[PDB]
Amino acid sequence: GRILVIEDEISLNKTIIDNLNEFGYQTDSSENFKDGEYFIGIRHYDLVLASWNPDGDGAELVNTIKHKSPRTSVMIMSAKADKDTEIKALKAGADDFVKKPLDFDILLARIEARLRLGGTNVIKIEDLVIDPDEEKITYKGQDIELKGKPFEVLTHLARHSDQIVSKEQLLDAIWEEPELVTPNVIEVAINQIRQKMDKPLNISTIETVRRRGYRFCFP
Amino acid sequence: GRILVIEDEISLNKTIIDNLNEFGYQTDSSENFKDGEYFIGIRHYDLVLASWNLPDGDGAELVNTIKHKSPRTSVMIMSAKADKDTEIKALKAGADDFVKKPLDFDILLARIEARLRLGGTNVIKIEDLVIDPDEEKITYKGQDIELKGKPFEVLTHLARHSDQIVSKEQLLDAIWEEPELVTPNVIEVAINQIRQKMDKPLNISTIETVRRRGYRFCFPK
DNA sequence: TTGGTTAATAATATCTTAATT
DNA sequence: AATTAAGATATTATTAACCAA
Structure with a gap:
């Protein structure tokens, strides 16, 4: 302005x-x-x-x-x-x-x-931005190399933060022919996300809730 | 366009x-x-x-x-x-x-x-990169690069949407009269010619490929 | 059992050439 | 110059073995 x-x-x-x-x-x-x-x-x-x-x-x-x-x-x-x-x-x-x-x-x-700006699908949570349109994640001003289905899994969770999402849900939401794939993909994708960010960037972005699912929990 | x-x-x-x-x-x-x-x-x-x-x-x-x-x-x-x-x-x-x-x-x-300049000037000037759509000319460090036609239009469209991802299907709709008839490989061949004339010889990173999304101009890098 | 963790390997994408136009 | 064909090569996705609890 x-x-x-x-x-x-x-x-x-x-x-x-x-x-x-x-x-x-x-x-x-x-x-x-x-x-x-x-x-x-x-x-x-x-x-x-x-x-x-x-x-x-x-x-x-x-x-x-x-x-x-x-x-x-x-x-x-x-x-x-x-x-x-x-x-x-x-x-x-x-x-x-x-x-x-x-x-x-x-x-x-x-x-x-x-000065009219189009509505964006960008998610900014504290020092982290997740841009689906450009498939880009940065925390503290540094890009994070996360892409593909792990990227969609993280963004999905972020959009449903403070809510527990289930393997089936993520699969249907992100995977076509969800009934033709191994659910292990979710676990592998989560590991990727933790690996790429949670681990190196010392944060707790994804939390697992036994027998219920995962939930974005980055405060 | x-x-x-x-x-x-x-x-x-x-x-x-x-x-x-x-x-x-x-x-x-x-x-x-x-x-x-x-x-x-x-x-x-x-x-x-x-x-x-209407x-x-x-x-x-x-x-x-x-x-x-x-x-x-x-x-x-x-x-x-x-x-x-x-x-x-x-x-x-x-x-x-x-x-x-x-x-x-x-x-x-x-x-x-x-x-359609998306806020830019008629002549794109980035670092020692000059792209003049009016004269279909490109200069780098005052040294000339011969690149024309589709490849030239593909690059100028990317650089005007710089730092943004433009899909193969968007590049076609913008530069080709009948995008449906042509194959998407035409874009890949154009990006190859662009890199073959600029990125490789000038040792610079201008076009980033983003898998399943398309291409992004990142010359500032 | 449940989840995570690795690793190989199958899929799929993109690129590079060469030819044709 | 423009378009395509095909293989070369790169990058995900999928899958399973494996480990810990």
């Missing part, structure tokens, strides 16, 4: 900030690029709203923002609304081009859409 | 399809929500361009459908009624952009291209 605005009109700059704050956005402000590039250096801003028109290096501005702070969105506001200025701003890297006099109902809607 | 065009006006539909094909995009055409959704189910589209006023089917409904079915598909709404309420509604419904009809195809293509 961090947006910084680079506008040399004080009125507009004042205006723009008050609108963003009203919406809910943490915001910073600059009247020149010099100061602006400074802020992006200190902390990340989800989006940057800057004027195309003092130094007149907007095309370069977009580039420098994308370089210094690659994850940020650049929105360019310009009173010259001709196709040439629109096309040239987008072609320079701008993620969106808005037109001033500013419609703040439309602007807020575009910023929103520009 | 594959673009799904949903538009009832048959004449406009073909004009849009022709402008996109000319640019170099793979394109499918539809004239109703149903047909559109059909395509959304069989093929992966990097971007859907849909009229807010003969049937709430525009908001269409946006939700595509966004849920394919969260990473960009949605762009076109409407001759382009008052503020309409634009804001579409954006809030989940659209990433809203453009007024009659379309200025110069600005349309500039905006489509800005959405």
Whole structure:
């Protein structure tokens, strides 16, 4: 929710900030690029709203923002609304081009859409993240080499944490033709998980409950 | 990049399809929500361009459908009624952009291209790696590498989805006109040519294979 | 018995070439 | 350049023997 605005009109700059704050956005402000590039250096801003028109290096501005702070969105506001200025701003890297006099109902809607994030299937528990989409596990910032069916078994359990899952359940949930395989696979997979993480990373992620099943228990 | 065009006006539909094909995009055409959704189910589209006023089917409904079915598909709404309420509604419904009809195809293509950069610049610059999709050129340390065609498009698509896993089936839908006809091995051969021209000679790790998922660009490594 | 623990080996995936186009 | 065919090679999955309790 961090947006910084680079506008040399004080009125507009004042205006723009008050609108963003009203919406809910943490915001910073600059009247020149010099100061602006400074802020992006200190902390990340989800989006940057800057004027195309003092130094007149907007095309370069977009580039420098994308370089210094690659994850940020650049929105360019310009009173010259001709196709040439629109096309040239987008072609320079701008993620969106808005037109001033500013419609703040439309602007807020575009910023929103520009910072809309898709729902994820990612699981973050304490210093551990488990990303099914990328088949990735990291604890304490280090990747864990766990994949395949052991990966699915761990993720399944994580999704049903504090709940006891049974071999049959895991098999049906993760194994096609579950009635054509050796249940030993579950035990082997659990060992793999303990081996890859529990053991080397000194944690207790999976717990076995006699005659009932396993349960993710990483507090 | 594959673009799904949903538009009832048959004449406009073909004009849009022709402008996109000319640019170099793979394109499918539809004239109703149903047909559109059909395509959304069989093929992966990097971007859907849909009229807010189809003969049937709430525009908001269409946006939700595509966004849920394919969260990473960009949605762009076109409407001759382009008052503020309409634009804001579409954006809030989940659209990433809203453009007024009659379309200025110069600005349309500039905006489509800005959405498909996934936040990037036109010229990808990573470390001493340069990938210029505009000149189909690649440089490393200012030294030129000859890589063109499908392999070039496979690599640029990966590097734009960098650090993400793109499946063989996604690479095909994005670069091949008829992904169903071609064999998935074509992707593996392209990845071999990419490694054969870059990773091996330049001693770098750019494409990571992830078994059963696909390929991921990891040049930063 | 129950679970875990190893290890080999069968499956399955991906890659690399060479040819054809 | 583009696509495929086939074997080469890599990587999981499966299976079972084995151990401890």
